[PDB]
Design a protein around this ligand. Structure first.
Ligand SMILES: COc1oc([C@H]2C/C(=C/C(C)=C/c3ccc([N+](=O)[O-])cc3)CO2)c(C)c(=O)c1C
Ligand code: SF4
Ligand code: SF4
Ligand code: SF4
Ligand code: SF4
Ligand code: SF4
Ligand code: FES
Lengths: 166, 196, 120, 756, 127, 102, 127
């Protein structure tokens, strides 16, 4: 039941969801190889709990927009997001995904917050694997309710909870 | 060895032979003789069909014969049976209001995808094609992008408090038809080439 | 010279009493949209005064597009840490530690204070 | 025509052609510093040097293509290694003492020296050998820097490369020699003992200076030349409508510059047009206001329109007035016209309507003026229609339209030599005051207001005038194709305009009418004039009214409903107006205007911060909806169709329309509304003291009335209460006080009083 | 040789004198221009005591009457120059060690410069 | 004309500053013409067809994407092969869909 | 192509669009919500271009929370477009100064530009 309504249990389930974040890769472009490199035997996101990698979308909570999001791929990825369980988070990786990037044209979605609800933004080209670790830790403390923005507000645990799906 | 005989064959029939001082050769064939001549070209021993590059000269500063122009690349691999290494180009202009061209898919299957791209990017429909279906651009995309009268379709860059940029109004670099920021551009900004 | 056009500079005229820059001109507003920025080095390469030079922080992951436009006073050499890092140190009361070490900082980074290989 | 050859290309070219224009006409290129279009070439920069053979007999030394004429069968060499070598050397000599200020230089990317240096500089010397850029390693020249020459212009004497463009301009174009060098040798520098830069056309050197020496103060340090968003448009402050370029960035007006259109203005803009922009981007109305408790409150367009419906529901169509501004477009004039056709109303008008329309007279092209024989002028061009002055400067120096090459306007017209004489026999001027052009009009007589009509009676031949008027009469009889030019003062007096019409109809002669309103000729063409009842823009006749300008306070007093469509918020409006709405300036509008020569001109919209403003087109369409009448126009495209139906030609096309109707109105003579270049709403920022109001008096009349030579006296006009600095002048007739008409209210003689 | 150092050092002294006059006679003094080979040094070292190269005394109407300039750090024929605009007056000052600042062989004392500036003020100033 | 001035003489020479300013705002203008040269990448023959109109920005750049045409041999090679081996035969075809899609 | 609705009147724009829409089936149509400033939707203003393929429809900038009832009218609008079976939703980002002149360009230019610059959007950001 949304992981809420108990002073202990919401902390417990936020702990669980935050540390057991199970990424759902959507490898698109050169950002995605910097996403793969964050798992090799020098700098691996294989410690916080992200060892296993559920390729199916029915089984994973974190979807990372990793690469330029060409428009012909916008709806498919959309449904990949809709093919996720509801307790799901989406990180926007790179400049091409966060904003239009340098490709400012007819072929690219100029901010992937358009098609999917973004949790964390991570600049870089591609954002260093260590920036990706920093973003997954950002999201870690965000879903515990331990995140505040520049304007002084604490941010909701799960983005994509505030959208009237349709 | 075969490139010399190509030149002797085409120059004998009065087709212009384009050459830059850099070592690449262009051979412009007319529309009619195009298909049959290039069939003879493949028969001449041209294993490999590298490229199909479509061109839109709408906004070119100097006028050109026709707006669209398709260039095929015919090559014979050096390491194959009897390889001279002869590689050359065939340019064929296509009118603005007549975007026709017979395919060489039947000769090289490589023109399956490539010509589709030129049909996708330019308004050029390739005759005799097995499947002329949009390759790259979204299925619902309307138009042909790479022709100059088709917008690049940019989005502004974003900043803090009403401060924005419109890059096409921001560009200090000049195209060919751009007169420049002074009265004009002459000298080394109208074309410059060092003499080795 | 920015291929993404992410750099904004509103100029102004120095005040002779307390000047900000060396010449007659300074940068009132200096914004760089890190979501547009692609990290070329073209702004470093074209800066004639050596002012704008890339640093070493990569730990700039934030939640909001509108907040990822790093300003002038968000990049000065005097500052130690990234925007989410400084906000965490402020809402936490615990000082900033950058998670990187380099053999040395370049001469172009005169003034750039950072951990150097373990010298401290 | 003469046959010329440049390096492989042969061109037919008219005989008086300069080698520089012929080279560019052939498609080649060569530097250019000292010479400039519409400026007398004199060989100074020595950049345009070419090689010449005139038979193979090459000339000994390189010919200055800027000041050299062409002869038949001549060969010109600009690609020989000798030419490029010499050009690089001269570039080095020019760059010699330059301050190294490029990165902070306000000229930025649009600097001729930069481009010609990178074009022709550093010839390829004959390797992978390391090159050295400069040889001069000595102490460079240092002079005074960022020197403010005037509240709009700043002067850096280090960046000057010692061309002649600014001093040559000032001597030739305006006739105001207020800039010239001081010392000689390498110590030479620009200076003046005339500091205020008195000429009102001083701003054009701002564009001409190939360096960042003379720059715009009001647009100093805002953005670089490329960063600015350049939108070409037309200036609608006055009826000459010069072509301008509006440089805007981030929603604010940065800088205004000249756009070349030789049919009307060559490359020139006036100071009122170019530096008079401070009011646009600073303070303007962005949310509609509605009056609820006798005060104005921000309102939704919906609630404003509700109040509009309720207030106009019980309105009969003969009590509604349609009063537009002087900048009202052809589209707007046509929609108000058609709406008053449907909505039967005898009173509509516009801001600068004259008792006698300017459409009464045949419109003349300015180049026709250059070809003309004589100009009988009544009024002051320099103030009433500024750049006319500049064309008069070509007119009286015997200049004529040049021959047209492939690159457009020629680079070096050999027709224009330096220090050219200005003739006293080609024009005759009659003004109520001593205009700056009276120096060049030997026939000149200072009269007082309302006195032209007698000069015109004297010119027709029904009575005898003074010696000056008899000289103008004789010269007007003898001229084969003269021009009659009427100011604003003439256009507001029915009899003087009637006699002008008679005079210029009997003699085949065109007329250049300097309306106080820019698009007055377009609104006339579209039929915007009152009917029988006829409450004019200054009359309190209607009971409901729509205003796009600020009327006299007696026009608002008495009405039942008053809706103003303004751009700023005016104290005159929050005491008598019930609804205020935001309107965009001509800078941010789109449409067409009608020149004082009958020529239609485009307005493109510039990306300025307008707010929630809506054009008078959409406002009238929504305002008729409260009355039942359906509007035929909402958009620009439908208005284009209905214009094309009304048979008004495409842009730059001249509109043919004549008119036979006079509405006489007496004029109460106590104060004069001096026709002025500087306009009232332009007094913001740096133009605050430049666009100040004046009250001119003769020393005796001041002495009698107690008007000090420096006093800020508050003066009350039917057109409002404004304070004005007092000037004593020897050309102002006794008993009159010439009050600066800072609007399109010129040429009016009104009652008044000096409040204490 | 090393005299170079004192040159720029001496230059600062000169500025003080100039500054003094403005505070003395209540006439506008202005820093005109700084050293470009100090602005455009990015990482490169810069040891000179000051970065200001050109200054002037402007009247109320803004036109300067006295100009002073120094040779850049890398330029040949290093000197200090003085000029009176509109008066065709120029001076080439050097510094001879032990003696002091000399116009050729004639030492340039503060009193000399002060009298010169006052003569310029009475002559060239418009207001 | 092709190389910006070295960073050290930006404070000595005027030509340096002008060339640096121009090169980093405008760029340079190569002559009018078309050109193309091939190279060998880990996926084969590669080349750029460059059309320049003498301006600061290229008129057209057409890229011979080796992974683009190397993909035509997918229906052929894996014809009659296994269904899983359709994956191993794609990995063995070595595509980089940044090169294909482009 | 038709232009219905009016600037800065969200409720009137919505009612006129209700009427002009009728029973038009939007199975293959395209809805372009044109705005400025991607990120900040709390203060957004919106235009609409409806590209049916057989005739096109224009709504000026009258919807969004920037106007009173523009948020509720935009929610109702997207619900209305979704009821009629729309699946392909786009958003165009223009410079503010463009938004005004883009409704006065000829249909082919305006529509071509919009289709080229469109971003696929999740309507949940407007519902
Ligand atoms: C495969 O190469 C490539 O991939 C991609 C995309 C797809 C992708 C898949 C998987 C399955 C990652 C993955 C790897 C390892 C694990 N693991 O748990 O070890 C989990 C997941 C990552 O980027 C792109 C774009 C590419 O262009 C190339 C050449
Ligand atoms: S931000 Fe850079 S690395 Fe990431 S997808 Fe874009 S181009 Fe590739
Ligand atoms: S590194 Fe500099 S030039 Fe490159 S994208 Fe970032 S801001 Fe632009
Ligand atoms: S005038 Fe031109 S060359 Fe001189 S400093 Fe300015 S931009 Fe540089
Ligand atoms: S100030 Fe400018 S226009 Fe005047 S002479 Fe010098 S370079 Fe020429
Ligand atoms: S003369 Fe008239 S149209 Fe020309 S710039 Fe001046 S005010 Fe504008
Ligand atoms: S020498 Fe200056 S242009 Fe002829």
């Amino acid at each position: 039941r949304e992981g809420i309504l108990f002073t202990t249990l919401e902390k417990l389930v936020a702990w669980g969801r935050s540390n057991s974040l199970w990424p759902a890769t959507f490898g698109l472009a050169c950002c995605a190889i910097e996403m793969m490199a964050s798992t090799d035997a020098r700098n691996d996101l294989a410690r916080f709990g992200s060892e296993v990698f559920r390729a199916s979308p029915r089984q994973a909570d974190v979807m990372i927009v990793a690469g330029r999001l060409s428009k012909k791929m916008a709806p498919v990825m959309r449904r990949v997001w809709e093919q996720m369980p509801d307790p799901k988070w989406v990180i926007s990786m790179g400049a091409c995904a966060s904003s239009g990037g340098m490709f400012n044209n007819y072929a690219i979605v100029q901010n992937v917050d358009s098609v999917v609800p973004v949790d964390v933004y991570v600049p870089g080209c591609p954002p260093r694997p260590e920036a990706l670790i920093y973003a997954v830790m950002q999201l870690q403390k965000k879903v515990r309710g331990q995140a505040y923005n520049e304007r002084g507000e604490r941010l909701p645990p799960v983005a994509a909870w505030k959208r009237t799906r349709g | 060895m075969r490139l010399e005989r190509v030149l002797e064959e085409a120059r004998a029939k009065g087709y212009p032979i384009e050459d830059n001082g850099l070592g690449n050769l262009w051979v412009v064939l007319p529309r009619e003789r195009f298909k049959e001549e290039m069939a003879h070209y493949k028969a001449m021993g041209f294993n490999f069909l590298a490229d199909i590059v479509g061109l839109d000269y709408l906004t070119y500063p100097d006028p050109r014969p026709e707006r669209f122009a398709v260039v095929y690349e015919l090559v014979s691999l050096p390491g194959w049976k009897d390889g001279d290494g002869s590689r050359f180009f065939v340019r064929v202009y296509v009118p603005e209001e007549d975007p026709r061209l017979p395919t060489v898919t039947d000769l090289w299957g490589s023109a399956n995808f490539l010509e589709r791209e030129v049909y996708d990017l330019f308004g050029i429909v390739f005759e005799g094609h097995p499947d002329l279906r949009k390759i790259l651009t979204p299925e619902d995309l309307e138009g042909h992008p790479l022709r100059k009268d088709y917008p690049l379709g940019e989005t502004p860059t974003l900043f803090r408090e009403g401060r924005y940029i419109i890059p096409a109004e921001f560009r200090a670099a000049l195209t060919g038809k751009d007169p420049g920021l002074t009265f004009y551009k002459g000298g080394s900004r109208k074309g410059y080439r060092s003499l080795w | 010279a920015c291929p993404a056009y992410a750099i904004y500079v509103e100029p102004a005229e120095n005040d002779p009493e307390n000047p900000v820059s060396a010449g007659e001109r300074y940068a009132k507003v200096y914004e760089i949209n890190m979501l547009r920025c692609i990290f070329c080095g073209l702004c470093e390469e074209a800066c004639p005064t050596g002012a704008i030079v890339l640093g070493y922080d990569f730990e700039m992951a934030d939640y909001e597009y509108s907040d990822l436009v790093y300003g002038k006073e968000d990049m000065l050499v005097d500052v130690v840490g990234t925007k989410p890092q400084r906000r965490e140190a402020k809402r936490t009361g615990k000082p900033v530690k950058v998670g990187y070490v380099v053999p040395y900082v370049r001469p172009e980074l005169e003034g750039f204070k950072a951990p150097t290989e373990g010298g401290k | 025509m003469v046959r010329v050859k440049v390096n492989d290309r042969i061109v037919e070219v008219p005989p008086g052609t300069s080698v520089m224009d012929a080279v560019f006409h052939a498609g080649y290129d060569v530097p250019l510093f000292c010479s400039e279009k519409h400026l007398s070439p004199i060989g100074a920069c020595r950049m345009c040097l070419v090689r010449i053979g005139l038979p193979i007999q090459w000339q000994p030394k390189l010919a200055a293509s800027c000041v050299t004429a062409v002869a038949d069968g001549m060969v010109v060499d600009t690609l020989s290694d000798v030419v490029r070598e010499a050009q690089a050397g001269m570039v080095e000599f020019t760059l010699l003492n330059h301050p190294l200020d490029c990165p902070t230089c306000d000229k930025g990317g649009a600097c001729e020296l930069q481009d010609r240096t990178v074009e022709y500089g550093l010839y390829e010397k004959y390797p992978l050998e390391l090159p050295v850029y400069t040889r001069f390693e000595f102490t460079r020249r240092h002079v005074d820097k960022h020197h403010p020459l005037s509240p709009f212009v700043i002067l850096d004497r280090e960046r000057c490369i010692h061309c002649k463009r600014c001093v040559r301009y000032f001597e030739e174009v305006p006739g105001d020699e207020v800039l010239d060098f001081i010392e000689r040798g390498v110590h030479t520098f620009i200076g003046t003992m005339d500091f205020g830069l008195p000429s009102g056309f001083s701003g054009n050197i701002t564009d001409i200076c190939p360096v960042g020496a003379l720059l715009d103060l009001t647009a100093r340090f805002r953005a670089r030349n490329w960063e600015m968003e350049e939108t070409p448009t037309t200036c609608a402050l006055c009826p000459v409508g010069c072509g301008i370029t509006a440089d805007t960035r981030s929603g604010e007006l940065l800088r205004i510059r000249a756009r070349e259109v030789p049919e009307v203005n060559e490359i020139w803009i006036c100071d009122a047009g170019r530096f008079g922009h401070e009011w646009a981007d600073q303070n303007r109305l962005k949310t509609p206001l509605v009056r609820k408790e006798g005060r104005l409150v921000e309102a939704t367009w919906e609630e404003a329109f509700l109040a509009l419906k309720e207030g106009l529901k019980e309105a009969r169509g003969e009590e509604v007035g349609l009063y537009l501004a002087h900048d009202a477009t052809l589209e707007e004039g046509l929609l108000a016209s058609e709406l008053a056709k449907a909505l039967k109303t005898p009173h509509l008008d516009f801001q600068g309507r004259t008792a006698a329309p300017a459409s009464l007279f045949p419109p003349a092209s300015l180049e026709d003026l250059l070809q003309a024989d004589f100009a009988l002028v009544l009024g002051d061009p320099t103030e009433e229609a500024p750049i006319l002055h500049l064309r008069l400067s070509e007119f009286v120096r015997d200049l004529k339209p040049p021959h047209r090459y492939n690159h457009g306007t020629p680079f070096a017209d050999l027709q224009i030599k330096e220090r050219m004489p200005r003739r006293t026999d080609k024009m005759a001027l009659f003004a109520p005051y001593r205009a700056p052009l009276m120096k060049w009009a030997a026939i000149h007589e200072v009269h007082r207001p309302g006195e032209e009509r007698e000069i015109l009676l004297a010119l027709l031949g029904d009575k005898e005038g003074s010696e000056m008027v008899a000289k103008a009469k004789e010269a007007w009889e003898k001229a084969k194709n003269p021009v009659l030019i009427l100011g604003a003062g003439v256009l507001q007096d029915t009899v003087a305009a009637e006699r002008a019409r008679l005079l210029a109809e009997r003699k085949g002669a065109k007329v250049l009418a300097m309306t106080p309103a820019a698009n007055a000729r377009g609104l006339e063409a579209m039929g915007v004039l009152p009917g029988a009842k006829g409450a004019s823009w200054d009359e309190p006749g209607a009971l409901y009214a729509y205003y796009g300008f600020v009327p006299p306070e007696e026009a608002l007093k008495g009405k039942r409903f008053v809706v103003m469509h303004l751009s700023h918020l005016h104290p005159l409006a929050e005491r008598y107006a019930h609804v205020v709405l935001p309107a965009p300036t001509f800078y941010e509008k789109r449409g067409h205007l009608v020149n004082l020569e009958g020529r239609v001109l485009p307005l493109s919209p510039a990306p300025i911060e307008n707010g929630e403003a809506e054009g008078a087109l959409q406002v009238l369409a929504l305002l008729a909806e409260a009355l039942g009448v359906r509007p035929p126009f909402r958009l620009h495209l439908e208005a284009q169709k209905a214009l094309k139906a009304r048979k008004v030609p495409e842009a730059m096309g001249r509109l043919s329309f004549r008119l036979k109707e006079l509405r006489p109105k007496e004029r109460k003579g106590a104060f004069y509304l001096r026709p002025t270049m500087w306009k009232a709403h332009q007094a913001v920022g740096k133009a605050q003291e430049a666009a100040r109001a004046e009250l001119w008096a003769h020393p005796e009349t001041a002495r009698a009335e107690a008007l000090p030579e420096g006093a800020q006296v508050a003066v009350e006009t039917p057109f409002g209460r404004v304070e004005a600095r007092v000037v004593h002048r020897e050309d102002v007739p006794k008993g009159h006080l010439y009050l600066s008409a800072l609007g399109p209210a010129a040429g009016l003689r009104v009652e008044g009083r000096v409040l204490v | 040789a090393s005299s170079e150092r004192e040159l720029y050092e001496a230059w600062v002294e000169l500025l003080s004198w100039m500054r003094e006059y403005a505070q003395a006679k209540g006439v506008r003094f202005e820093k005109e221009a700084d050293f470009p080979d100090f602005i455009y040094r990015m990482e490169r070292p810069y040891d000179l005591p000051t970065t200001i190269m050109t200054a002037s005394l402007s009247d109320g109407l803004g036109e300067p009457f006295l100009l002073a300039d120094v040779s850049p750090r890398h330029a040949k024929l290093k000197r200090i120059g003085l000029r009176l605009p509109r008066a065709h007056i120029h001076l080439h000052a050097h510094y001879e060690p032990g003696k002091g600042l000399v116009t050729g062989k004639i030492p340039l004392t503060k009193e000399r410069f002060f009298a010169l500036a006052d003569r310029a003020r009475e002559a060239l100033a418009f207001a | 004309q092709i190389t910006p001035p070295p960073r050290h003489l930006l404070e000595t020479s005027m030509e340096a500053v002008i060339y640096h300013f121009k090169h980093y705002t405008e760029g340079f203008h190569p002559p009018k013409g078309e050109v193309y040269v091939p190279t060998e990448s880990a996926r084969g023959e590669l080349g750029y067809y460059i059309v320049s109109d003498g301006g600061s920005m290229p008129y057209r750049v057409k890229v011979r994407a080796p992974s683009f045409v190397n993909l035509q041999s997918l229906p052929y090679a894996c014809k009659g092969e296994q269904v899983p081996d359709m994956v191993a035969i794609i990995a063995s075809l070595d595509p980089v869909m940044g090169d294909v899609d482009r | 192509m038709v232009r219905v609705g009016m600037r800065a009147a969200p409720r009137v724009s919505l009612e006129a669009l209700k009427a002009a829409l009728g029973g038009l089936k939007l199975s293959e149509a395209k809805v372009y919500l044109i705005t400025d400033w991607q990120d900040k939707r709390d203060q957004a203003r919106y235009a609409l271009l409806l590209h049916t393929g057989k005739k096109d429809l224009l709504v000026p900038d009258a919807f969004g929370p920037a106007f009173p009832g523009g948020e509720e009218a935009l929610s109702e609008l997207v619900g209305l477009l979704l009821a009629q079976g729309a699946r392909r939703f786009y958003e165009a980002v223009v410079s503010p100064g463009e938004m005004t002149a883009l409704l006065d360009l000829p249909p082919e230019e305006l529509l071509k530009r919009v289709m080229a610059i469109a971003n696929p959007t999740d309507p949940g950001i407007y519902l």
